[PDB]
Design a protein around this ligand. Structure first.
Ligand SMILES: Cc1ncc(C[n+]2csc(CCOP(=O)(O)OP(=O)(O)O)c2C)c(N)n1
Ligand SMILES: [Mg+2]
Length: 525
């Protein structure tokens, strides 16, 4: 049968038909004789490779298979893998390794200490000891990434292994299925349910793993029965709730003191699918005001152990959310009032304000559109001004790693052809993963790229305001032509220097059959 044939049989039997890669010499014996039932998505830089696969996996809610070249190709993808760890993203990262006979010699393209290079961003890293073990190793790689908490995994395979004969017992791997859909036992669950019904002013914090689980609808019901406000946890990688539902309270501030003040007055605070408050800024204070008890449901033991406060349960987010929403009694309390409609900012005929750009997206864009965010100074306004009523409608780099949104948008749009993907990316952020645009052109993935050009790293200048950071170099990015960049990679390029220009550009981009980039002149932060 051979390792090559057996592995490709194992991948299809495990449901994988797509390979996101940038080719290399160690990868040719694996890439050769490519099965007709598989499809290869090529990106020009390995950060783009993983980013595309990442968005594809997050929207599909299935594993994604990557093929990179040795250490150099693995190294270029490490920033993406960092984002891919904090988003519990099921990624099977494979890298070709030199012939076993020359690894000790360290011949050119040898990945030295290969399993250590991904760490500590990968749940599992491995280099098989024997060619016939490779399929088994791939099997571990798939399940490791698939099993909760979902995470990136790494497998280095010497290129001489693919032609060798596979183990005849490797066929037992093909139909292996491991379940993680677990929930709290009835006795402890009923205790929790009794505490939610007893709470006089409960509150719900929802994290990215809620959207990863597609537990949004269950979380809506739970919020309705509890008649409880709902916040999305800070540094949110995803949107787990309808942003215009009367219970939704918006994006929590990323500060210790600021979160405990918001939570003050709620006896029970139920967190689901979220790390227990990840803070960006140092806002020292009380983690919790007195009279507030916190219960956290998480798929990740690291999150449960990490918490500075509260109880925690390590279970499946989907199974827990569905159990809690169907078990709780409907509260007599009145439903919370929907947050106020956002105000319209003054907009002259000149450079566009971010608020105006987000309002124009909301009226113009489809109700089932998918948004992506790498405009770091405008996140607060984007959450307020974009009505996202459906799951899988928002993605933001989980670890804050720039270069995610542009390639990921191509991956999401590939995963969801029926939904229109609009990526709002700031200037400067677009540079990290710029080559990915080519993949959208070559495969005609019709992602819309909206570039917010202010000529600066807006968030960095704003933050340098918090604290007296004066005379900080490297904060301005003047003189980039994004329409020229989009042409270089074959993406149709549009511009928008005013509102009417923006309105027209958007209507055109929505009608386009190919990818489109719109460079937007925006006002400085
Ligand atoms: C890979 C990486 N490099 C650098 C940073 C630091 N960083 C955080 S926000 C930011 C500015 C982003 O620029 P832009 O898209 O213009 O954002 P805005 O003007 O909206 O703040 C930078 C450089 C990062 N988070 N990740
Ligand atoms: Mg900017």
């Amino acid at each position: 049968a051979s390792v090559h044939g057996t592995t490709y049989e194992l991948l299809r039997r495990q449901g994988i038909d797509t390979v996101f890669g940038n080719p290399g010499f160690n990868e040719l014996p694996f890439l050769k004789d490519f099965p007709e039932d598989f499809r290869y998505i090529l990106a020009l830089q390995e950060a783009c490779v993983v980013g595309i696969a990442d968005g594809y996996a997050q929207a599909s809610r299935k594993p994604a298979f990557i093929n990179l070249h040795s250490a150099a190709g693995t190294g270029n993808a490490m920033g993406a893998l960092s984002n891919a760890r904090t988003s519990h993203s099921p990624l099977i990262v494979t890298a070709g390794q030199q012939t076993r006979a020359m690894i000790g010699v360290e011949a050119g393209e040898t990945n030295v200490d290969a399993a250590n290079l991904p760490r500590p961003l990968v749940k599992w890293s491995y280099e098989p000891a024997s060619a016939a073990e490779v399929p088994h190793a791939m099997s571990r790689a798939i399940h490791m990434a698939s099993m909760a908490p979902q995470g990136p995994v790494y497998l280095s395979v010497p290129y001489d292994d693919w032609d060798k004969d596979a183990d005849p017992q490797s066929h037992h791997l093909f139909d292996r299925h491991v379940s993680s859909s677990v929930r709290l036992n009835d006795q402890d669950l009923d205790i929790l349910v009794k505490a939610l019904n007893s709470a006089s002013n409960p509150a719900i914090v929802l994290g990215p793993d809620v959207d990863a689980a597609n537990a949004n609808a269950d979380c809506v019901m739970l919020a309705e029965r509890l008649k409880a406000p709902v916040w999305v946890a800070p540094s949110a990688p995803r949107c787990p709730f309808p942003t215009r539902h009367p219970c939704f309270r918006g994006l929590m501030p990323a500060g210790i003191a600021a979160i405990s003040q918001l939570l003050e007055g709620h006896d029970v605070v139920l967190v689901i699918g979220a790390p227990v408050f990840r803070y960006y800024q140092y806002d020292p204070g009380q983690y919790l005001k007195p009279g507030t008890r916190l219960i956290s449901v998480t798929c990740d033991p690291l999150e449960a152990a990490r918490a500075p406060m509260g109880d925690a349960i390590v279970a499946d987010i989907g199974a827990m959310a569905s159990a809690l929403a169907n078990l709780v009694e409907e509260s007599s309390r009145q439903l919370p009032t929907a947050a106020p409609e956002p105000a319209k900012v003054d907009q002259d005929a000149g450079r566009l304000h971010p608020e105006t750009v987000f309002d124009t997206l909301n009226d113009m864009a489809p109700e089932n559109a998918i948004y992506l965010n790498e405009s770091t100074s405008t996140t607060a306004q984007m959450w307020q001004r974009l009505n996202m009523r459906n799951p899988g409608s928002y993605y933001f780099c989980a670890a804050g790693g720039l270069g995610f949104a542009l390639p990921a948008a191509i991956g999401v749009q590939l995963a969801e052809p029926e939904r229109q993907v609009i990526a709002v990316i700031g200037d400067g952020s677009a540079n990290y993963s710029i080559s990915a645009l080519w993949t959208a052109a070559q495969y005609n993935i019709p992602t819309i790229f909206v570039i917010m050009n202010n000529g600066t790293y807006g968030m960095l200048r704003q933050f340098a305001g918090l604290l007296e950071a004066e005379n900080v170099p490297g904060l301005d990015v003047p003189g980039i032509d994004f329409r020229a960049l989009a042409k270089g990679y074959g993406v149709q390029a549009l511009k928008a220097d005013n509102l009417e220009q923006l309105k027209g550009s958007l209507q055109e981009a929505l009608s386009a059959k190919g990818p489109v980039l719109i460079e937007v002149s925006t006002v400085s932060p």
